[PDB]
Amino acid sequence: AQYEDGKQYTTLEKPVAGAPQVLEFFSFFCPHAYQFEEVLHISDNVKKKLPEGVKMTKYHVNFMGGDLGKDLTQAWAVAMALGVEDKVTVPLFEGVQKTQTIRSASDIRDVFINAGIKGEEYDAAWNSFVVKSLVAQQEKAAADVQLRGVPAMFVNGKYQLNPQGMDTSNMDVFVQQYADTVKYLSEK
């Protein structure tokens, strides 16, 4: 009796095959993406409620940060490829966004090195076909779910996430209200 299109989720008009199971986008540049992941760690909360050990993917976006984002992506393309991720998430948010201490490829490079990434084993993957492919397919991936803004999210290449059709005043609440909507759309 209670689960609404345009409300808590929105279904995609042109949907996309071979798409990941749940596919959060994000930049290291949206003060909101920061708020989304760094403040509310919604990502983890969604994981938690999530059904039977399910592909919780997460791609980065190019538009914001122009020439830097580009590499910040590529950096991340690696960070998945290895991948540290978890280990390189927090500092790269904390870097670029919150303190303004990241200037380009190597500032990032450093934040990998500095986070337990092996000096130029990072560079050893950075140019690997592995990570060209990864990058290119996180452009493609966005252009597919026809993207505009970030954070975003897409259950099984079908449902754009509408964070709106949900409490907006209560944090603790909206989270579980968010993380829930996923458990639903997944097994559906």
């Binding site: 930049s27 949206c30 003060p31 909101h32 919604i42 914001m64 993207l147 803004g149 709106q164």
Partner: protein, 145 residues
């Protein structure tokens, strides 16, 4: 009000539109929504409802009751987030026009976004526009409604 708006047209309108493409600056997404909840009054009370005839301007009353209004929070919501950001938000680079009416592609040149991360007087851009979106609200509500 055609007198106000004719000189808000030939005096205020494009002090907007130009004096950005004048220094060739990049918009945002909310940008051209605010340009729309704008150029959809300085055109939508001119060729609008103060009209090419000025006996009956309560059609323009609603053309201001709920159009200067959008202009308010468009700028407001926009400006809200400047050092005060929010979880359930986004930050975009692309834009829209429902009703299969299509802003973007009609005028590629000015109905276009380019989403990114200065200074205007003792201020910057967006607030300075609440300084008129909420100005051309009350001191326009007062005399008509």
């Amino acid at each position: 009000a055609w007198l106000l708006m004719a000189f808000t047209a030939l005096a205020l309108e494009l002090t907007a539109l130009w004096f950005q493409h004048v220094m060739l600056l990049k918009p945002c997404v909310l940008c051209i929504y605010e340009r729309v909840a704008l150029f959809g009054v300085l055109g939508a009370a001119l060729i609008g409802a103060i009209a090419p005839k000025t006996p009956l301007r309560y059609v323009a009353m609603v053309i201001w009751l709920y159009s200067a209004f959008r202009g308010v929070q468009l700028t407001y919501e926009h400006t809200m987030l400047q050092l005060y950001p929010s979880p359930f938000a986004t930050c975009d680079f692309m834009v829209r026009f429902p009703e299969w009416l299509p802003l973007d592609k009609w005028v590629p040149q000015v109905f276009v976004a380019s989403g990114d991360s200065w200074d205007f007087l003792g201020l910057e851009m967006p607030q300075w526009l609440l300084g008129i979106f909420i100005a051309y609200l009350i001191v326009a509500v007062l005399v008509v409604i």
